[PDB]
Amino acid sequence: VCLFLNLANDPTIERIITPRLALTTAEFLAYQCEKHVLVILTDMSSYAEALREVSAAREEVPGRRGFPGYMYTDLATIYERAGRVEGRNGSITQIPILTMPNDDITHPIPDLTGYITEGQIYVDRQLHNRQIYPPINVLPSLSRLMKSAIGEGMTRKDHADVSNQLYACYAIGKDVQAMKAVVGEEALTSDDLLYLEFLQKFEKNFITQGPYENRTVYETLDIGWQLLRIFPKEMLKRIPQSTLSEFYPR
Amino acid sequence: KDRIEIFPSRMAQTIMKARLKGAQTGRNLLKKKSDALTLRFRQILKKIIETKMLMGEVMREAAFSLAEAKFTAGDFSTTVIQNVNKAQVKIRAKKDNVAGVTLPVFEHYHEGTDSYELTGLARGGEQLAKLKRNYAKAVELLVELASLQTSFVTLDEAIKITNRRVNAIEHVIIPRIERTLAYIITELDEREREEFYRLKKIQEKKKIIKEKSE
Amino acid sequence: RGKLIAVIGDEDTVTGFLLGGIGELNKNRHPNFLVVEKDTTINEIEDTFRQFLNRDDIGIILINQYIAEMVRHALDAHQRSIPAVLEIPSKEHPYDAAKDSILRRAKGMF
Amino acid sequence: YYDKHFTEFVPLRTKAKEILQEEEDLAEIVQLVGKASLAETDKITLEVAKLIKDDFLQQNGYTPYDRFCPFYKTVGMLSNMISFYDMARRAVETTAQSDNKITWSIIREHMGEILYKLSSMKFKDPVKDGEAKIKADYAQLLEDMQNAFRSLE
Amino acid sequence: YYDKHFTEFVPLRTKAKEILQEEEDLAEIVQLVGKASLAETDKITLEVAKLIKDDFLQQNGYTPYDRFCPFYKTVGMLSNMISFYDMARRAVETTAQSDNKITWSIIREHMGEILYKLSSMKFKDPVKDGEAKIKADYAQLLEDMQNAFRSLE
């Protein structure tokens, strides 16, 4: 790990170069030394605030919601210094982390960021108040590149199938839970109860992890199957029969 | 009317967005209530259609059986009508918690008090016994029949009331919230512009003052 | 215990049900039924129907279809749930179908 | 600190947060459906959460009893209210799908004086009354609740 | 001024405002309910309020009869509209608890000619028909209404 700390009481201009130094290092390590670098930029919202201060120092007229008119290209300047390059075995990835002012995803900071990034993780509040860690809500999250990240030769054959089925099962379980609140437990059928059981055990076993348990991709998929084997084969509509026959039993 | 008439502000944006989310959630939860009531209604519709038809056929058999009892006994109806004191069958009220709405249903209750023993006319006891059984069946069907009908009427009112509320959210309340929110957003951008104008002129006036000093 | 079933109908209809074990006298010696003969008038049927609606111990009332036609205004005028009223075919009148409350409530049924 | 001195606070804190959040979600639907359909556990959450909101999270800071509530007392109050929650939840879920089904209404009628005592805990008045006694008094409430459910089950 | 020259104007002005405000208070909820929960006294407000809105508050300024509305005519025709309101509201208030309630549908069919005449009251052409004819016409309609209620109630 190469760690850069720019403190809240440190010079606000230094906060602007900090992510530039982090990426400058990442580019050296990744592309010149043939290795894969994960770059984590924490509290880009604090960067954006420092950037607005620099704009004021230049006596520039503020743009939308007080931010510089060039905030778009400035964020792209940082964000896009990543990815793979031809002829070299290194790479840079990024996980920018952004605080949503007033918890409004419409705010220019998460809006201008998301508009030029590929999907989102999206951490919720309800999951936190329910004392679930990590508090990540899988329904509003998206990784547009997951289709290329996973599959035979990269993770496991069934990766894509387990993900798609779990997503549908969780979304349905939430839908059944909403129904339960209206009609009661006795008004539910057997399939609805399976989706309710999945929802409760999915969050408790699959999503809830703890900060010191490291679950590799293969254990994560195996845990997924433990949740999927709640259902009989006929209800797992999004998993091809070939995948079920190999992985479903046992 | 067209808007909730909340003065444009960032505070209004937060309230309207939360209000919109609430209205949308209520719409979906009430829609689920309606769907649950509709399924039971439709299942109850089929049950009532099966019952009413059967009731006809059962009365056809009971009426014939009565004629048979009459053939043997002669005029037993007079004794039965005059000599009445206690019932063997009574009906208990039960509640059917079909959803948030609770519907009244009747339930057959076989209280057990013995019926009149009649062998006085031609001793036609076997025909009277078959006749009792034929009507006993009719009584149980009719109880179910009413019970289904009462729960059904209460549910049909429940469906129309729930659907009317859902329709109002969709056609009256949300459109109005969305118009209010769009109004707020537009007016706030208008305020941003006039602030931009003033700040730009301030920057230009400062540059003009600086030129004069040179 | 809870509720009794009252019957307003012809001689055979009432007799059959009474043998069916349904129907009894109240503590005031009133009967929860009426036998409707050719000499029975409209006021007697209507007043009886109303009183059954005014009794808290009755509820389901069983009436012959031809009778419901005679005092039809009273059966549509009162819309509640205690007085669930079922209309049945008499020994000679044919099977009911038309003017049935349920067939009217539901526009998807025969 | 909490695990060193108390060992009980951290897990009580976790459960307290779960109950308050569960109540908000149940409140959203109850305002819509009027409690027409609730699980027995859901009814307990709503009523214990009201116990918490009114008799734990609410205090008159101008009274001798609530001018300052010492931490040992704050955790004492929460410990008993959650202990009630777990015992009430166990009783209704343990006897569920059986003959002698226990519900909250049955619990309130069986051990109603327990809720009276729980709602009165804010009044033990520290400094006027002693620390050792207040802790002993809260222990008595826990013992009474435990015996109340034993006789109910 | 009004007390010196008219007297009747002020209580009529107040009643008219109360009717219009009550109608607005109802319209807000009626749009959502569908006119299902309305009492007979409320339907009278809603329909008389319509009477006021369509015939009293609006006028076509490019006609020989609405080009000018002398004040005495405005208060004259308002008196009749309010007098109808009071007679219709009393008619139901004194009968709703009896063995025959005068609902809107009964008064509407019995007095349908009055409701049309009330709407025609604007078409008086003060230039062709002077004060004497307008007052006599308005007075006659008031008597006609009063007689209709006597035969109705």
PDB file of C-alpha atoms in Angstrom, chain A:
ATOM      1  CA  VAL A   1       0.000   0.000   0.000  1.00  0.00           C
ATOM      2  CA  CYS A   2       1.140   3.521  -0.816  1.00  0.00           C
ATOM      3  CA  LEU A   3      -0.818   5.801   1.493  1.00  0.00           C
ATOM      4  CA  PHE A   4      -1.407   9.526   1.045  1.00  0.00           C
ATOM      5  CA  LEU A   5      -3.126  11.405   3.863  1.00  0.00           C
ATOM      6  CA  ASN A   6      -4.377  14.947   3.300  1.00  0.00           C
ATOM      7  CA  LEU A   7      -5.919  16.085   6.567  1.00  0.00           C
ATOM      8  CA  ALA A   8      -8.952  18.329   6.922  1.00  0.00           C
ATOM      9  CA  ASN A   9      -6.776  21.058   8.444  1.00  0.00           C
ATOM     10  CA  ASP A  10      -4.049  20.755   5.804  1.00  0.00           C
ATOM     11  CA  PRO A  11      -3.658  23.329   3.012  1.00  0.00           C
ATOM     12  CA  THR A  12      -6.605  23.108   0.644  1.00  0.00           C
ATOM     13  CA  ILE A  13      -4.397  23.434  -2.437  1.00  0.00           C
ATOM     14  CA  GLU A  14      -2.458  20.365  -1.308  1.00  0.00           C
ATOM     15  CA  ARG A  15      -5.698  18.479  -1.306  1.00  0.00           C
ATOM     16  CA  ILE A  16      -5.907  19.176  -5.051  1.00  0.00           C
ATOM     17  CA  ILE A  17      -2.509  17.672  -5.920  1.00  0.00           C
ATOM     18  CA  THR A  18      -2.929  14.796  -3.492  1.00  0.00           C
ATOM     19  CA  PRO A  19      -5.010  12.733  -5.975  1.00  0.00           C
ATOM     20  CA  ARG A  20      -2.621  13.832  -8.707  1.00  0.00           C
ATOM     21  CA  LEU A  21       0.319  12.426  -6.737  1.00  0.00           C
ATOM     22  CA  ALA A  22      -1.612   9.222  -6.084  1.00  0.00           C
ATOM     23  CA  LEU A  23      -2.298   8.731  -9.785  1.00  0.00           C
ATOM     24  CA  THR A  24       1.206   9.854 -10.721  1.00  0.00           C
ATOM     25  CA  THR A  25       2.523   7.071  -8.506  1.00  0.00           C
ATOM     26  CA  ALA A  26      -0.066   4.644  -9.875  1.00  0.00           C
ATOM     27  CA  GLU A  27       1.026   5.382 -13.455  1.00  0.00           C
ATOM     28  CA  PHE A  28       4.675   4.830 -12.596  1.00  0.00           C
ATOM     29  CA  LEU A  29       4.016   1.579 -10.718  1.00  0.00           C
ATOM     30  CA  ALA A  30       1.437   0.209 -13.151  1.00  0.00           C
ATOM     31  CA  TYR A  31       2.786   1.038 -16.580  1.00  0.00           C
ATOM     32  CA  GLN A  32       6.539   1.253 -16.057  1.00  0.00           C
ATOM     33  CA  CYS A  33       6.932  -1.571 -13.512  1.00  0.00           C
ATOM     34  CA  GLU A  34       4.472  -4.063 -15.058  1.00  0.00           C
ATOM     35  CA  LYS A  35       2.094  -4.605 -12.154  1.00  0.00           C
ATOM     36  CA  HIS A  36      -1.568  -4.108 -11.329  1.00  0.00           C
ATOM     37  CA  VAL A  37      -2.434  -1.095  -9.172  1.00  0.00           C
ATOM     38  CA  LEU A  38      -5.726  -0.523  -7.365  1.00  0.00           C
ATOM     39  CA  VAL A  39      -6.254   3.183  -6.715  1.00  0.00           C
ATOM     40  CA  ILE A  40      -8.769   4.222  -4.031  1.00  0.00           C
ATOM     41  CA  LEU A  41      -9.637   7.958  -3.934  1.00  0.00           C
ATOM     42  CA  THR A  42     -11.484   8.613  -0.636  1.00  0.00           C
ATOM     43  CA  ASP A  43     -13.841  11.602  -0.139  1.00  0.00           C
ATOM     44  CA  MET A  44     -13.792  13.089  -3.657  1.00  0.00           C
ATOM     45  CA  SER A  45     -16.482  15.354  -2.290  1.00  0.00           C
ATOM     46  CA  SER A  46     -13.821  17.036  -0.121  1.00  0.00           C
ATOM     47  CA  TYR A  47     -11.651  17.375  -3.207  1.00  0.00           C
ATOM     48  CA  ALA A  48     -14.508  19.074  -5.052  1.00  0.00           C
ATOM     49  CA  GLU A  49     -14.896  21.536  -2.182  1.00  0.00           C
ATOM     50  CA  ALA A  50     -11.185  22.348  -2.251  1.00  0.00           C
ATOM     51  CA  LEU A  51     -11.433  22.801  -6.025  1.00  0.00           C
ATOM     52  CA  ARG A  52     -14.233  25.332  -5.580  1.00  0.00           C
ATOM     53  CA  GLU A  53     -11.970  27.239  -3.202  1.00  0.00           C
ATOM     54  CA  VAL A  54      -9.217  27.352  -5.830  1.00  0.00           C
ATOM     55  CA  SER A  55     -11.718  28.714  -8.362  1.00  0.00           C
ATOM     56  CA  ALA A  56     -12.675  31.457  -5.917  1.00  0.00           C
ATOM     57  CA  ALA A  57      -8.988  32.253  -5.405  1.00  0.00           C
ATOM     58  CA  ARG A  58      -8.783  32.871  -9.151  1.00  0.00           C
ATOM     59  CA  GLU A  59     -11.856  35.161  -8.924  1.00  0.00           C
ATOM     60  CA  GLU A  60     -13.800  32.924 -11.302  1.00  0.00           C
ATOM     61  CA  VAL A  61     -17.583  33.239 -11.406  1.00  0.00           C
ATOM     62  CA  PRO A  62     -19.060  30.076  -9.831  1.00  0.00           C
ATOM     63  CA  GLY A  63     -21.004  27.695 -12.040  1.00  0.00           C
ATOM     64  CA  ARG A  64     -23.840  25.250 -11.299  1.00  0.00           C
ATOM     65  CA  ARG A  65     -24.488  24.951  -7.509  1.00  0.00           C
ATOM     66  CA  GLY A  66     -21.343  27.030  -6.825  1.00  0.00           C
ATOM     67  CA  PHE A  67     -18.914  24.638  -8.499  1.00  0.00           C
ATOM     68  CA  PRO A  68     -16.508  25.566 -11.321  1.00  0.00           C
ATOM     69  CA  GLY A  69     -17.742  25.207 -14.869  1.00  0.00           C
ATOM     70  CA  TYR A  70     -14.747  22.965 -15.507  1.00  0.00           C
ATOM     71  CA  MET A  71     -15.525  20.471 -12.728  1.00  0.00           C
ATOM     72  CA  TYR A  72     -16.497  17.963 -15.414  1.00  0.00           C
ATOM     73  CA  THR A  73     -13.123  17.901 -17.153  1.00  0.00           C
ATOM     74  CA  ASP A  74     -11.238  18.148 -13.858  1.00  0.00           C
ATOM     75  CA  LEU A  75     -12.866  14.970 -12.552  1.00  0.00           C
ATOM     76  CA  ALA A  76     -12.300  13.235 -15.885  1.00  0.00           C
ATOM     77  CA  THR A  77      -8.658  14.339 -15.786  1.00  0.00           C
ATOM     78  CA  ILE A  78      -8.226  12.356 -12.573  1.00  0.00           C
ATOM     79  CA  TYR A  79     -10.611   9.481 -13.247  1.00  0.00           C
ATOM     80  CA  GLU A  80      -9.527   8.548 -16.770  1.00  0.00           C
ATOM     81  CA  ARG A  81      -5.834   8.094 -15.888  1.00  0.00           C
ATOM     82  CA  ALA A  82      -6.510   4.382 -15.485  1.00  0.00           C
ATOM     83  CA  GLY A  83      -7.172   1.196 -17.439  1.00  0.00           C
ATOM     84  CA  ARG A  84      -5.111  -1.229 -19.486  1.00  0.00           C
ATOM     85  CA  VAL A  85      -2.645  -0.323 -22.234  1.00  0.00           C
ATOM     86  CA  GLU A  86      -1.497  -2.336 -25.227  1.00  0.00           C
ATOM     87  CA  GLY A  87       1.767  -4.239 -24.933  1.00  0.00           C
ATOM     88  CA  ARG A  88       2.159  -4.009 -21.145  1.00  0.00           C
ATOM     89  CA  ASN A  89       0.989  -6.315 -18.366  1.00  0.00           C
ATOM     90  CA  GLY A  90       0.125  -3.580 -15.864  1.00  0.00           C
ATOM     91  CA  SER A  91      -3.237  -1.948 -15.186  1.00  0.00           C
ATOM     92  CA  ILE A  92      -4.860   0.726 -13.034  1.00  0.00           C
ATOM     93  CA  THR A  93      -8.339   0.473 -11.550  1.00  0.00           C
ATOM     94  CA  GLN A  94     -10.125   3.066  -9.420  1.00  0.00           C
ATOM     95  CA  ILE A  95     -12.736   2.976  -6.665  1.00  0.00           C
ATOM     96  CA  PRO A  96     -13.494   6.690  -6.073  1.00  0.00           C
ATOM     97  CA  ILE A  97     -15.538   7.100  -2.839  1.00  0.00           C
ATOM     98  CA  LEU A  98     -17.990  10.032  -2.710  1.00  0.00           C
ATOM     99  CA  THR A  99     -20.188  11.452   0.067  1.00  0.00           C
ATOM    100  CA  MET A 100     -23.585  12.504  -1.244  1.00  0.00           C
ATOM    101  CA  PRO A 101     -24.490  15.981   0.054  1.00  0.00           C
ATOM    102  CA  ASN A 102     -27.936  15.809   1.662  1.00  0.00           C
ATOM    103  CA  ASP A 103     -28.004  12.177   0.434  1.00  0.00           C
ATOM    104  CA  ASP A 104     -29.172  13.397  -2.991  1.00  0.00           C
ATOM    105  CA  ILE A 105     -27.662  11.390  -5.894  1.00  0.00           C
ATOM    106  CA  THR A 106     -28.674  14.306  -8.145  1.00  0.00           C
ATOM    107  CA  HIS A 107     -26.038  16.620  -6.588  1.00  0.00           C
ATOM    108  CA  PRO A 108     -23.340  17.678  -9.088  1.00  0.00           C
ATOM    109  CA  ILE A 109     -20.613  15.762  -7.247  1.00  0.00           C
ATOM    110  CA  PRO A 110     -22.054  12.212  -7.541  1.00  0.00           C
ATOM    111  CA  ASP A 111     -23.854  13.164 -10.756  1.00  0.00           C
ATOM    112  CA  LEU A 112     -20.790  14.446 -12.593  1.00  0.00           C
ATOM    113  CA  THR A 113     -18.788  11.507 -11.253  1.00  0.00           C
ATOM    114  CA  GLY A 114     -21.270   8.761 -12.120  1.00  0.00           C
ATOM    115  CA  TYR A 115     -21.926  10.287 -15.543  1.00  0.00           C
ATOM    116  CA  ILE A 116     -18.337   9.369 -16.533  1.00  0.00           C
ATOM    117  CA  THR A 117     -17.827   6.152 -14.557  1.00  0.00           C
ATOM    118  CA  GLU A 118     -18.869   2.564 -15.213  1.00  0.00           C
ATOM    119  CA  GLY A 119     -21.608   1.606 -12.739  1.00  0.00           C
ATOM    120  CA  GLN A 120     -21.717   2.197  -8.948  1.00  0.00           C
ATOM    121  CA  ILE A 121     -21.478   0.252  -5.614  1.00  0.00           C
ATOM    122  CA  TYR A 122     -23.937   2.509  -3.657  1.00  0.00           C
ATOM    123  CA  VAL A 123     -23.823   2.201   0.196  1.00  0.00           C
ATOM    124  CA  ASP A 124     -27.298   2.593   1.853  1.00  0.00           C
ATOM    125  CA  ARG A 125     -28.476   3.898   5.248  1.00  0.00           C
ATOM    126  CA  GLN A 126     -31.271   1.461   6.122  1.00  0.00           C
ATOM    127  CA  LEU A 127     -28.824  -1.452   6.029  1.00  0.00           C
ATOM    128  CA  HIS A 128     -26.546   0.458   8.398  1.00  0.00           C
ATOM    129  CA  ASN A 129     -29.309   1.303  10.859  1.00  0.00           C
ATOM    130  CA  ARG A 130     -30.223  -2.390  10.797  1.00  0.00           C
ATOM    131  CA  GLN A 131     -26.627  -3.074  11.922  1.00  0.00           C
ATOM    132  CA  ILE A 132     -25.589  -4.871   8.740  1.00  0.00           C
ATOM    133  CA  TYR A 133     -21.940  -4.603   7.721  1.00  0.00           C
ATOM    134  CA  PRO A 134     -21.125  -4.080   4.985  1.00  0.00           C
ATOM    135  CA  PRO A 135     -24.353  -1.873   4.401  1.00  0.00           C
ATOM    136  CA  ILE A 136     -24.190  -2.214   0.559  1.00  0.00           C
ATOM    137  CA  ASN A 137     -27.577  -2.372  -1.264  1.00  0.00           C
ATOM    138  CA  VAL A 138     -27.288  -4.754  -4.227  1.00  0.00           C
ATOM    139  CA  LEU A 139     -30.495  -3.685  -6.000  1.00  0.00           C
ATOM    140  CA  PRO A 140     -29.355   0.008  -7.026  1.00  0.00           C
ATOM    141  CA  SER A 141     -25.678  -1.024  -7.574  1.00  0.00           C
ATOM    142  CA  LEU A 142     -24.277  -1.965 -11.032  1.00  0.00           C
ATOM    143  CA  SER A 143     -20.946  -2.982 -12.541  1.00  0.00           C
ATOM    144  CA  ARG A 144     -21.155  -2.632 -16.319  1.00  0.00           C
ATOM    145  CA  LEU A 145     -17.901  -4.563 -16.798  1.00  0.00           C
ATOM    146  CA  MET A 146     -18.890  -7.572 -14.698  1.00  0.00           C
ATOM    147  CA  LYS A 147     -19.706  -9.434 -17.929  1.00  0.00           C
ATOM    148  CA  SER A 148     -16.007  -9.329 -18.795  1.00  0.00           C
ATOM    149  CA  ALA A 149     -14.631  -9.670 -15.255  1.00  0.00           C
ATOM    150  CA  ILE A 150     -16.098 -13.097 -14.591  1.00  0.00           C
ATOM    151  CA  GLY A 151     -16.441 -16.424 -16.361  1.00  0.00           C
ATOM    152  CA  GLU A 152     -14.445 -19.516 -17.180  1.00  0.00           C
ATOM    153  CA  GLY A 153     -10.717 -18.877 -17.089  1.00  0.00           C
ATOM    154  CA  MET A 154     -11.139 -15.824 -14.880  1.00  0.00           C
ATOM    155  CA  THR A 155     -13.237 -16.971 -11.908  1.00  0.00           C
ATOM    156  CA  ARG A 156     -15.579 -19.995 -12.238  1.00  0.00           C
ATOM    157  CA  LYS A 157     -18.002 -21.221 -14.882  1.00  0.00           C
ATOM    158  CA  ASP A 158     -21.120 -20.503 -12.804  1.00  0.00           C
ATOM    159  CA  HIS A 159     -20.213 -17.002 -11.669  1.00  0.00           C
ATOM    160  CA  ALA A 160     -22.543 -15.136 -14.036  1.00  0.00           C
ATOM    161  CA  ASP A 161     -25.421 -17.527 -13.389  1.00  0.00           C
ATOM    162  CA  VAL A 162     -25.197 -17.335  -9.593  1.00  0.00           C
ATOM    163  CA  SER A 163     -25.125 -13.534  -9.670  1.00  0.00           C
ATOM    164  CA  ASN A 164     -28.180 -13.223 -11.911  1.00  0.00           C
ATOM    165  CA  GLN A 165     -30.242 -15.688  -9.883  1.00  0.00           C
ATOM    166  CA  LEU A 166     -29.321 -14.160  -6.527  1.00  0.00           C
ATOM    167  CA  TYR A 167     -30.244 -10.678  -7.744  1.00  0.00           C
ATOM    168  CA  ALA A 168     -33.683 -11.838  -8.865  1.00  0.00           C
ATOM    169  CA  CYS A 169     -34.209 -13.790  -5.648  1.00  0.00           C
ATOM    170  CA  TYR A 170     -33.283 -10.811  -3.458  1.00  0.00           C
ATOM    171  CA  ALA A 171     -35.471  -8.429  -5.458  1.00  0.00           C
ATOM    172  CA  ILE A 172     -38.360 -10.881  -5.211  1.00  0.00           C
ATOM    173  CA  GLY A 173     -37.790 -11.470  -1.496  1.00  0.00           C
ATOM    174  CA  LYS A 174     -38.068  -7.731  -0.909  1.00  0.00           C
ATOM    175  CA  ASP A 175     -41.276  -7.751  -2.953  1.00  0.00           C
ATOM    176  CA  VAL A 176     -42.697 -10.617  -0.889  1.00  0.00           C
ATOM    177  CA  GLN A 177     -41.627  -8.899   2.327  1.00  0.00           C
ATOM    178  CA  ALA A 178     -43.599  -5.840   1.229  1.00  0.00           C
ATOM    179  CA  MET A 179     -46.574  -8.108   0.552  1.00  0.00           C
ATOM    180  CA  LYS A 180     -46.218  -9.768   3.966  1.00  0.00           C
ATOM    181  CA  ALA A 181     -46.593  -6.383   5.628  1.00  0.00           C
ATOM    182  CA  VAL A 182     -50.021  -6.085   3.935  1.00  0.00           C
ATOM    183  CA  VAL A 183     -51.519  -9.599   3.879  1.00  0.00           C
ATOM    184  CA  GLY A 184     -49.726 -11.299   6.765  1.00  0.00           C
ATOM    185  CA  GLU A 185     -47.797 -14.542   7.056  1.00  0.00           C
ATOM    186  CA  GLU A 186     -50.821 -16.831   6.720  1.00  0.00           C
ATOM    187  CA  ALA A 187     -51.731 -15.276   3.359  1.00  0.00           C
ATOM    188  CA  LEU A 188     -48.422 -16.325   1.805  1.00  0.00           C
ATOM    189  CA  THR A 189     -47.910 -19.428  -0.322  1.00  0.00           C
ATOM    190  CA  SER A 190     -44.960 -21.828  -0.206  1.00  0.00           C
ATOM    191  CA  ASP A 191     -43.002 -20.047  -2.944  1.00  0.00           C
ATOM    192  CA  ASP A 192     -43.411 -16.711  -1.186  1.00  0.00           C
ATOM    193  CA  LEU A 193     -42.131 -18.232   2.058  1.00  0.00           C
ATOM    194  CA  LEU A 194     -39.049 -19.515   0.236  1.00  0.00           C
ATOM    195  CA  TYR A 195     -38.369 -15.990  -1.015  1.00  0.00           C
ATOM    196  CA  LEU A 196     -38.866 -14.634   2.500  1.00  0.00           C
ATOM    197  CA  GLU A 197     -36.503 -17.242   3.937  1.00  0.00           C
ATOM    198  CA  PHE A 198     -33.984 -16.396   1.225  1.00  0.00           C
ATOM    199  CA  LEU A 199     -34.204 -12.691   2.019  1.00  0.00           C
ATOM    200  CA  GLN A 200     -33.542 -13.237   5.714  1.00  0.00           C
ATOM    201  CA  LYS A 201     -30.694 -15.702   5.220  1.00  0.00           C
ATOM    202  CA  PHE A 202     -29.266 -13.862   2.195  1.00  0.00           C
ATOM    203  CA  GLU A 203     -28.633 -10.704   4.189  1.00  0.00           C
ATOM    204  CA  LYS A 204     -27.491 -12.569   7.299  1.00  0.00           C
ATOM    205  CA  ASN A 205     -25.099 -15.040   5.611  1.00  0.00           C
ATOM    206  CA  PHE A 206     -24.141 -13.581   2.227  1.00  0.00           C
ATOM    207  CA  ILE A 207     -24.124  -9.798   2.632  1.00  0.00           C
ATOM    208  CA  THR A 208     -23.235  -9.596   6.332  1.00  0.00           C
ATOM    209  CA  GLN A 209     -19.539 -10.364   6.598  1.00  0.00           C
ATOM    210  CA  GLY A 210     -17.597  -8.504   9.263  1.00  0.00           C
ATOM    211  CA  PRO A 211     -14.504  -6.376   8.749  1.00  0.00           C
ATOM    212  CA  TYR A 212     -11.936  -9.139   9.312  1.00  0.00           C
ATOM    213  CA  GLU A 213     -13.353 -12.062   7.330  1.00  0.00           C
ATOM    214  CA  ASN A 214     -11.789 -12.278   3.875  1.00  0.00           C
ATOM    215  CA  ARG A 215     -14.102 -14.141   1.513  1.00  0.00           C
ATOM    216  CA  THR A 216     -12.485 -15.098  -1.772  1.00  0.00           C
ATOM    217  CA  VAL A 217     -14.535 -15.249  -4.973  1.00  0.00           C
ATOM    218  CA  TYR A 218     -14.862 -19.035  -4.822  1.00  0.00           C
ATOM    219  CA  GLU A 219     -16.136 -19.066  -1.239  1.00  0.00           C
ATOM    220  CA  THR A 220     -18.501 -16.222  -2.126  1.00  0.00           C
ATOM    221  CA  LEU A 221     -19.981 -18.297  -4.951  1.00  0.00           C
ATOM    222  CA  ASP A 222     -20.234 -21.363  -2.708  1.00  0.00           C
ATOM    223  CA  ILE A 223     -22.103 -19.262  -0.147  1.00  0.00           C
ATOM    224  CA  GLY A 224     -24.342 -18.103  -2.980  1.00  0.00           C
ATOM    225  CA  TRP A 225     -25.170 -21.703  -3.817  1.00  0.00           C
ATOM    226  CA  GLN A 226     -26.005 -22.381  -0.164  1.00  0.00           C
ATOM    227  CA  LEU A 227     -28.651 -19.677  -0.510  1.00  0.00           C
ATOM    228  CA  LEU A 228     -29.827 -20.881  -3.933  1.00  0.00           C
ATOM    229  CA  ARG A 229     -30.245 -24.484  -2.759  1.00  0.00           C
ATOM    230  CA  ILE A 230     -33.120 -23.168  -0.644  1.00  0.00           C
ATOM    231  CA  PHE A 231     -35.167 -23.272  -3.832  1.00  0.00           C
ATOM    232  CA  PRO A 232     -36.017 -26.361  -5.878  1.00  0.00           C
ATOM    233  CA  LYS A 233     -34.463 -26.484  -9.326  1.00  0.00           C
ATOM    234  CA  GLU A 234     -37.686 -25.442 -11.069  1.00  0.00           C
ATOM    235  CA  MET A 235     -37.740 -22.005  -9.408  1.00  0.00           C
ATOM    236  CA  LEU A 236     -34.175 -21.067 -10.448  1.00  0.00           C
ATOM    237  CA  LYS A 237     -35.312 -19.763 -13.807  1.00  0.00           C
ATOM    238  CA  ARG A 238     -32.186 -17.748 -14.633  1.00  0.00           C
ATOM    239  CA  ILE A 239     -29.661 -20.594 -14.257  1.00  0.00           C
ATOM    240  CA  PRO A 240     -29.308 -22.927 -17.271  1.00  0.00           C
ATOM    241  CA  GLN A 241     -29.931 -26.604 -16.624  1.00  0.00           C
ATOM    242  CA  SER A 242     -26.311 -27.486 -17.412  1.00  0.00           C
ATOM    243  CA  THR A 243     -25.087 -25.203 -14.621  1.00  0.00           C
ATOM    244  CA  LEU A 244     -27.639 -26.562 -12.143  1.00  0.00           C
ATOM    245  CA  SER A 245     -26.727 -30.189 -12.826  1.00  0.00           C
ATOM    246  CA  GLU A 246     -23.043 -29.549 -12.104  1.00  0.00           C
ATOM    247  CA  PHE A 247     -23.228 -27.181  -9.131  1.00  0.00           C
ATOM    248  CA  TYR A 248     -26.717 -27.315  -7.571  1.00  0.00           C
ATOM    249  CA  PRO A 249     -26.468 -30.627  -5.641  1.00  0.00           C
ATOM    250  CA  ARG A 250     -24.369 -31.301  -2.535  1.00  0.00           C
TER     251      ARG A 250
END
